[PDB]
Design an enzyme around this catalytic site. Structure first.
Site, PDB file in Angstrom:
ATOM      1  N   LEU B 148       0.855  -1.178   0.000  1.00 32.31           N
ATOM      2  CA  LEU B 148       0.000   0.000   0.000  1.00 32.31           C
ATOM      3  C   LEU B 148       0.894   1.231   0.000  1.00 32.31           C
ATOM      4  O   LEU B 148       0.753   2.142   0.823  1.00 32.31           O
ATOM      5  CB  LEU B 148      -0.986  -0.008   1.163  1.00 32.31           C
ATOM      6  CG  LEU B 148      -2.151   0.976   0.952  1.00 32.31           C
ATOM      7  CD1 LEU B 148      -3.202   0.396   0.037  1.00 32.31           C
ATOM      8  CD2 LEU B 148      -2.766   1.433   2.247  1.00 32.31           C
ATOM      9  N   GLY B 149       1.816   1.232  -0.969  1.00 31.96           N
ATOM     10  CA  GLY B 149       2.816   2.281  -1.116  1.00 31.96           C
ATOM     11  C   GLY B 149       2.316   3.300  -2.103  1.00 31.96           C
ATOM     12  O   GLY B 149       1.112   3.604  -2.145  1.00 31.96           O
ATOM     13  N   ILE B 151       1.960   3.149  -5.378  1.00 28.82           N
ATOM     14  CA  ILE B 151       1.045   2.528  -6.352  1.00 28.82           C
ATOM     15  C   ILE B 151      -0.138   1.844  -5.654  1.00 28.82           C
ATOM     16  O   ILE B 151      -1.296   2.014  -6.064  1.00 28.82           O
ATOM     17  CB  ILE B 151       1.792   1.557  -7.279  1.00 28.82           C
ATOM     18  CG1 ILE B 151       2.920   2.262  -8.038  1.00 28.82           C
ATOM     19  CG2 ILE B 151       0.798   0.948  -8.278  1.00 28.82           C
ATOM     20  CD1 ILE B 151       3.806   1.341  -8.879  1.00 28.82           C
ATOM     21  N   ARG B 171       4.246  -4.232   6.151  1.00 29.05           N
ATOM     22  CA  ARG B 171       4.961  -4.537   7.406  1.00 29.05           C
ATOM     23  C   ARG B 171       4.629  -3.525   8.491  1.00 29.05           C
ATOM     24  O   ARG B 171       4.613  -3.860   9.683  1.00 29.05           O
ATOM     25  CB  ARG B 171       6.461  -4.640   7.174  1.00 29.05           C
ATOM     26  CG  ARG B 171       6.844  -5.843   6.292  1.00 29.05           C
ATOM     27  CD  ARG B 171       8.250  -5.763   5.743  1.00 29.05           C
ATOM     28  NE  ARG B 171       8.468  -4.557   4.934  1.00 29.05           N
ATOM     29  CZ  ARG B 171       9.605  -4.228   4.335  1.00 29.05           C
ATOM     30  NH1 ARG B 171      10.688  -5.001   4.464  1.00 29.05           N
ATOM     31  NH2 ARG B 171       9.672  -3.108   3.635  1.00 29.05           N
ATOM     32  N   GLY B 227       3.057  -6.403  -9.446  1.00 31.05           N
ATOM     33  CA  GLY B 227       4.326  -6.095  -8.764  1.00 31.05           C
ATOM     34  C   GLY B 227       5.508  -6.728  -9.447  1.00 31.05           C
ATOM     35  O   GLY B 227       6.033  -6.194 -10.442  1.00 31.05           O
ATOM     36  N   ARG B 228       5.933  -7.868  -8.900  1.00 35.55           N
ATOM     37  CA  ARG B 228       6.949  -8.685  -9.489  1.00 35.55           C
ATOM     38  C   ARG B 228       6.508 -10.124  -9.476  1.00 35.55           C
ATOM     39  O   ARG B 228       5.914 -10.610  -8.483  1.00 35.55           O
ATOM     40  CB  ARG B 228       8.278  -8.522  -8.735  1.00 35.55           C
ATOM     41  CG  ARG B 228       8.956  -7.178  -8.994  1.00 35.55           C
ATOM     42  CD  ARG B 228       9.529  -7.159 -10.407  1.00 35.55           C
ATOM     43  NE  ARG B 228      10.221  -5.921 -10.732  1.00 35.55           N
ATOM     44  CZ  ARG B 228       9.680  -4.827 -11.267  1.00 35.55           C
ATOM     45  NH1 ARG B 228       8.391  -4.742 -11.544  1.00 35.55           N
ATOM     46  NH2 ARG B 228      10.479  -3.807 -11.575  1.00 35.55           N
ATOM     47  N   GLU B 257      10.389 -13.750 -17.108  1.00 41.75           N
ATOM     48  CA  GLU B 257      10.000 -13.003 -18.284  1.00 41.75           C
ATOM     49  C   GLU B 257      11.054 -13.056 -19.385  1.00 41.75           C
ATOM     50  O   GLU B 257      12.252 -13.018 -19.075  1.00 41.75           O
ATOM     51  CB  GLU B 257       9.713 -11.539 -17.918  1.00 41.75           C
ATOM     52  CG  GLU B 257       8.513 -11.394 -17.007  1.00 41.75           C
ATOM     53  CD  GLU B 257       8.359 -10.005 -16.438  1.00 41.75           C
ATOM     54  OE1 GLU B 257       8.935  -9.038 -16.985  1.00 41.75           O
ATOM     55  OE2 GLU B 257       7.629  -9.899 -15.423  1.00 41.75           O
ATOM     56  N   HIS B 275       4.006  -7.457 -19.072  1.00 38.87           N
ATOM     57  CA  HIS B 275       4.613  -6.413 -18.264  1.00 38.87           C
ATOM     58  C   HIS B 275       4.390  -5.003 -18.837  1.00 38.87           C
ATOM     59  O   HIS B 275       5.344  -4.274 -19.153  1.00 38.87           O
ATOM     60  CB  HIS B 275       6.078  -6.795 -18.055  1.00 38.87           C
ATOM     61  CG  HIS B 275       6.716  -6.144 -16.861  1.00 38.87           C
ATOM     62  ND1 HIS B 275       7.904  -6.599 -16.336  1.00 38.87           N
ATOM     63  CD2 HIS B 275       6.362  -5.060 -16.126  1.00 38.87           C
ATOM     64  CE1 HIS B 275       8.233  -5.842 -15.302  1.00 38.87           C
ATOM     65  NE2 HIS B 275       7.329  -4.892 -15.170  1.00 38.87           N
TER      66      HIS B 275
HETATM   67  N1  LIG Z   1       3.965  -4.112 -13.541  1.00 38.35           N
HETATM   68  C1  LIG Z   1       4.719  -3.007 -13.752  1.00 38.35           C
HETATM   69  O1  LIG Z   1       4.936  -2.566 -14.862  1.00 38.35           O
HETATM   70  C2  LIG Z   1       5.211  -2.245 -12.550  1.00 38.35           C
HETATM   71  C3  LIG Z   1       5.323  -0.870 -12.650  1.00 38.35           C
HETATM   72  C4  LIG Z   1       5.736  -0.135 -11.552  1.00 38.35           C
HETATM   73  C5  LIG Z   1       5.999  -0.836 -10.389  1.00 38.35           C
HETATM   74  N2  LIG Z   1       5.922  -2.162 -10.306  1.00 38.35           N
HETATM   75  C6  LIG Z   1       6.253  -2.806  -9.043  1.00 38.35           C
HETATM   76  O2  LIG Z   1       5.518  -2.166  -8.024  1.00 38.35           O
HETATM   77  C7  LIG Z   1       6.294  -2.128  -6.850  1.00 38.35           C
HETATM   78  C8  LIG Z   1       5.734  -1.114  -5.859  1.00 38.35           C
HETATM   79  O3  LIG Z   1       5.982   0.208  -6.330  1.00 38.35           O
HETATM   80  P1  LIG Z   1       5.652   1.449  -5.396  1.00 38.35           P
HETATM   81  O4  LIG Z   1       6.063   2.672  -6.069  1.00 38.35           O
HETATM   82  O5  LIG Z   1       4.261   1.359  -4.889  1.00 38.35           O
HETATM   83  O6  LIG Z   1       6.599   1.148  -4.147  1.00 38.35           O
HETATM   84  P2  LIG Z   1       6.561   1.680  -2.642  1.00 38.35           P
HETATM   85  O7  LIG Z   1       5.912   3.021  -2.595  1.00 38.35           O
HETATM   86  O8  LIG Z   1       7.954   1.426  -2.066  1.00 38.35           O
HETATM   87  O9  LIG Z   1       5.591   0.629  -1.959  1.00 38.35           O
HETATM   88  C9  LIG Z   1       5.954  -0.681  -1.596  1.00 38.35           C
HETATM   89  C10 LIG Z   1       4.885  -1.203  -0.670  1.00 38.35           C
HETATM   90  O10 LIG Z   1       5.116  -2.589  -0.397  1.00 38.35           O
HETATM   91  C11 LIG Z   1       5.173  -2.787   1.019  1.00 38.35           C
HETATM   92  N3  LIG Z   1       6.064  -3.904   1.321  1.00 38.35           N
HETATM   93  C12 LIG Z   1       7.382  -4.020   0.979  1.00 38.35           C
HETATM   94  N4  LIG Z   1       7.914  -5.145   1.381  1.00 38.35           N
HETATM   95  C13 LIG Z   1       6.870  -5.804   2.033  1.00 38.35           C
HETATM   96  C14 LIG Z   1       6.791  -7.042   2.705  1.00 38.35           C
HETATM   97  N5  LIG Z   1       7.859  -7.868   2.807  1.00 38.35           N
HETATM   98  N6  LIG Z   1       5.618  -7.396   3.260  1.00 38.35           N
HETATM   99  C15 LIG Z   1       4.576  -6.570   3.160  1.00 38.35           C
HETATM  100  N7  LIG Z   1       4.536  -5.375   2.535  1.00 38.35           N
HETATM  101  C16 LIG Z   1       5.723  -5.041   1.992  1.00 38.35           C
HETATM  102  C17 LIG Z   1       5.631  -1.453   1.561  1.00 38.35           C
HETATM  103  O11 LIG Z   1       5.224  -1.294   2.927  1.00 38.35           O
HETATM  104  P3  LIG Z   1       6.207  -1.690   4.149  1.00 38.35           P
HETATM  105  O12 LIG Z   1       7.643  -1.282   3.797  1.00 38.35           O
HETATM  106  O13 LIG Z   1       5.716  -0.911   5.387  1.00 38.35           O
HETATM  107  O14 LIG Z   1       6.170  -3.199   4.296  1.00 38.35           O
HETATM  108  C18 LIG Z   1       4.896  -0.490   0.662  1.00 38.35           C
HETATM  109  O15 LIG Z   1       3.544  -0.230   1.082  1.00 38.35           O
HETATM  110  C19 LIG Z   1       7.667  -1.831  -7.425  1.00 38.35           C
HETATM  111  O16 LIG Z   1       8.686  -2.167  -6.493  1.00 38.35           O
HETATM  112  C20 LIG Z   1       7.743  -2.677  -8.696  1.00 38.35           C
HETATM  113  O17 LIG Z   1       8.327  -3.939  -8.455  1.00 38.35           O
HETATM  114  C21 LIG Z   1       5.508  -2.882 -11.352  1.00 38.35           C
HETATM  115  O1  LIG Z   2       8.689   0.606 -13.067  1.00 41.01           O
HETATM  116  C1  LIG Z   2       8.745  -0.604 -12.877  1.00 41.01           C
HETATM  117  O2  LIG Z   2       9.192  -1.150 -11.819  1.00 41.01           O
HETATM  118  C2  LIG Z   2       8.256  -1.631 -13.898  1.00 41.01           C
HETATM  119  O3  LIG Z   2       7.825  -2.716 -13.561  1.00 41.01           O
HETATM  120  C3  LIG Z   2       8.294  -1.220 -15.370  1.00 41.01           C
HETATM  121  O4  LIG Z   2       7.705   0.060 -15.430  1.00 41.01           O
HETATM  122  C4  LIG Z   2       9.717  -1.184 -15.946  1.00 41.01           C
HETATM  123  O5  LIG Z   2       9.642  -1.011 -17.365  1.00 41.01           O
HETATM  124  C5  LIG Z   2      10.476  -2.481 -15.657  1.00 41.01           C
HETATM  125  O6  LIG Z   2      10.221  -2.934 -14.327  1.00 41.01           O
HETATM  126  C6  LIG Z   2      11.973  -2.367 -15.796  1.00 41.01           C
HETATM  127  O7  LIG Z   2      12.557  -3.572 -15.321  1.00 41.01           O
HETATM  128 MG   LIG Z   3       8.651   0.523   3.724  1.00 36.04          MG
END
Ligand SMILES: NC(=O)c1ccc[n+]([C@@H]2O[C@H](COP(=O)([O-])OP(=O)(O)OC[C@H]3O[C@@H](n4cnc5c(N)ncnc54)[C@H](OP(=O)(O)O)[C@@H]3O)[C@@H](O)[C@H]2O)c1
Ligand SMILES: O=C(O)C(=O)[C@@H](O)[C@H](O)[C@H](O)CO
Ligand SMILES: [Mg+2]
Ligand SMILES: NC(=O)c1ccc[n+]([C@@H]2O[C@H](COP(=O)([O-])OP(=O)(O)OC[C@H]3O[C@@H](n4cnc5c(N)ncnc54)[C@H](OP(=O)(O)O)[C@@H]3O)[C@@H](O)[C@H]2O)c1
Ligand SMILES: O=C(O)C(=O)[C@@H](O)[C@H](O)[C@H](O)CO
Ligand SMILES: [Cl-]
Ligand SMILES: [Cl-]
Ligand SMILES: [Cl-]
Ligand SMILES: [Cl-]
Ligand SMILES: [Mg+2]
Ligand SMILES: [Mg+2]
Ligand SMILES: [Mg+2]
Ligand code: NA
Ligand code: NA
Lengths: 319, 318
Positions: B148-149, B151, B171, B227-228, B257, B275
């Site tokens: 719940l960060g 995104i 966490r 996420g991942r 991937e 992705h």
């Molecule tokens: N599909 C795509 O194209 C795409 C695009 C952008 C991002 N993503 C993925 O989205 C992820 C999140 O991005 P964001 O900007 O939202 O990151 P963020 O603001 O750092 O949010 C991460 C969230 O995950 C929680 N978290 C981390 N580790 C955890 C654990 N072990 N157990 C429970 N909760 C946990 C964090 O809370 P706590 O630290 O308090 O646990 C936080 O709420 C990225 O890291 C990336 O891998 C994917």
């Molecule tokens: O921003 C992220 O974390 C993503 O998942 C995508 O937007 C990226 O293109 C990709 O992860 C690069 O590895």
């Molecule tokens: Mg954190």
């Protein structure tokens, strides 16, 4: 004894399952007066999805009620029903959130090419050619105009509020209390917005309202989404606009002559097409089925329908 | 001018803007075997995806890795930190885009919109009639957000407007929000029927969505992963789908991937995307800009724009 209800053509089986709670059911395979036999002339109600031709409706001298499956009831000649003192009911409200959900999904699919991206993956192109091309369009920074802001239009607007886009609307009368920009003309809204969502009924007043002028005003980043009725869009003019790049893309759930979709519309890589699915989940179609049957049950038991349409605010007189 | 290595594929906007301050060194893949002697003076890397340690360690003067993406699990940040190398990512500029995609994927998973479009495009509407009614719907669902960060919160804000219950697991709770916090993933899974995964791909999240979590999610359960891939036990998911342990899944990300297991492609209740959650022109342009602007800030001011949590570094130059 029990009232006899005609069900012409296809309908959700839940309607057929529940009619025996109070009724006898008469089935014909299509909505065609030629299939009406002499022993069907005592029918007192119809449950119908889609078109109810006037000659079929008028084959039944004792007809009291047409329970339309769907919130749209443009397939029923409500003017003719009203002239005969026949109540018409629809299925508002039970599908509102479902249809709004679909509208958003169709919009996102149109903008981000999600179905195309999934086809790319499923056809093995991710492995062999790499990433799906970047979508030229996005919802980010868009301005959305709702043509219609009724039960469903408002539900769509509420969703869109949470996506961080500007919201405007066009209806014949403004809805005071809401903080959305009203436009007194469709073409003026189209000018002002880049995303036009159609969610009006299919009436004489909306027939081909989305025409060449509206599409031109929408503009070269313009995206048209139709979740109302096909008749509201000039389908030929849309194909021309898409072909010329007058607009950027379109998402359509409804068409002029369903289930027929013109070949040219199928060609465009910047168009999403759905076979009239906006309410088509099991749960929502079950709720619609329930409302059709419960309208008939209320009418015959209490004399008051649950959801009569505006044109027929009628109460039962038993003859 | 500092020399920046760009290994493998990257948005051309990165390459276009590097000349504002830098020389660009390109290699065709992220592979240390492609590093030549004359590349030993490189001071920065701009990279999308994996940055193998042997490649990162081929550069004695390396100061900064500017990761393309908010996720930076392809960079060994522990190793970068050990070497005093700052790592930057691209948060915020993609938040709303990714949240949009997450909602679209959820709706496509529930309502089978891509399948309905295929039905129409294959001519089945005419000959076979209506597309079958979707067994699932968003109506009446309870959604749990794992993460719940930036995104996750943006997804939750969208979901608020769809009239569903919202819960989350992280966490540490985020006070001030009116969403139900669950201190364990499996406890949230029990409580909800829809699980949206939006955590980073770290050691702490590796295969967190396992057989137990999927079983708790339950027979109406829908899993959405934006996420991942590493965070989901892909084999356990295939088993759950096959057995009807859960009702459906929508996945934008995968363990390996661009490879997707053949079994996942078989299911009529699964939506798959390559992705794409950030993959619009506008958002990728903004991400590209942020990569470059991080490098420019580092070399001009000594302070990156968006360094990652593990590397809160300031530049030391002689
Ligand atoms: N599909 C795509 O194209 C795409 C695009 C952008 C991002 N993503 C993925 O989205 C992820 C999140 O991005 P964001 O900007 O939202 O990151 P963020 O603001 O750092 O949010 C991460 C969230 O995950 C929680 N978290 C981390 N580790 C955890 C654990 N072990 N157990 C429970 N909760 C946990 C964090 O809370 P706590 O630290 O308090 O646990 C936080 O709420 C990225 O890291 C990336 O891998 C994917
Ligand atoms: O921003 C992220 O974390 C993503 O998942 C995508 O937007 C990226 O293109 C990709 O992860 C690069 O590895
Ligand atoms: Mg954190
Ligand atoms: N795709 C699908 O599966 C699906 C599912 C359900 C419904 N629908 C369609 O959606 C339609 C709307 O449903 P609803 O429940 O939202 O109906 P509603 O509550 O009656 O809303 C109709 C809206 O359209 C406006 N409108 C009507 N005629 C107009 C005109 N000539 N010019 C401008 N605005 C006009 C109305 O405002 P004013 O009266 O002030 O003009 C009102 O805002 C239905 O009639 C049906 O055809 C489609
Ligand atoms: O409710 C409506 O008006 C719809 O568009 C669909 O939900 C119906 O199935 C259709 O109208 C039946 O004609
Ligand atoms: Cl149905
Ligand atoms: Cl007829
Ligand atoms: Cl890119
Ligand atoms: Cl290597
Ligand atoms: Mg029909
Ligand atoms: Mg009105
Ligand atoms: Mg110094
Ligand atoms: Na316009
Ligand atoms: Na559960």
């Amino acid at each position: 004894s029990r009232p006899r209800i005609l069900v012409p053509g296809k309908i959700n089986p839940r309607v057929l399952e529940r009619l025996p709670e109070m009724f006898e059911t008469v089935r014909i395979e299509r909505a065609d007066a030629a299939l009406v036999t002499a022993d069907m002339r005592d029918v007192s109600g119809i449950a119908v999805s889609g078109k109810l031709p006037v000659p079929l409706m008028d084959a039944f001298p004792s007809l009291e009620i047409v329970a339309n499956f769907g919130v749209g009831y443009d397939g029923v000649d409500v003017s003719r029903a009203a002239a005969r003192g026949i109540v018409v009911t629809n299925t508002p409200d039970v599908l509102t959130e479902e249809v709004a959900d679909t509208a958003i999904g169709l919009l996102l699919n149109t903008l981000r090419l999600l179905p195309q991206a999934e086809q790319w993956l499923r056809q093995g192109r991710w492995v062999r050619e790499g990433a799906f091309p970047l979508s030229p369009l996005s919802l980010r920074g868009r301005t959305v105009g709702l043509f219609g802001l009724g039960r469903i239009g408002l539900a769509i607007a509420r969703r869109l509020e949470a996506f961080g886009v500007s919201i405007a609307y066009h209806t014949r009368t403004p809805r005071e209390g809401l903080g959305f920009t009203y436009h007194p003309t469709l073409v003026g809204m189209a000018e002002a917005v880049d995303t036009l969502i159609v969610i009006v009924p299919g009436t004489a007043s909306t027939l081909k309202a989305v025409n060449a002028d509206v599409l031109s005003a929408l503009g070269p980043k313009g995206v048209l989404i139709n979740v109302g009725r096909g008749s509201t869009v000039d389908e030929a003019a849309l194909v021309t606009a898409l072909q010329n790049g007058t607009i950027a893309g379109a998402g359509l759930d409804v068409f002029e002559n369903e289930p027929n979709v013109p070949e040219a519309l199928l060609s465009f890589p910047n168009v999403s097409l759905l076979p009239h699915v906006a309410s088509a989940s099991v749960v929502t179609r079950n709720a619609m089925s329930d409302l059709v049957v419960d309208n008939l049950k209320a009418w015959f038991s209490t004399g008051e329908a649950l959801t009569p349409v505006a044109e027929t605010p009628f109460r039962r007189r038993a003859i």
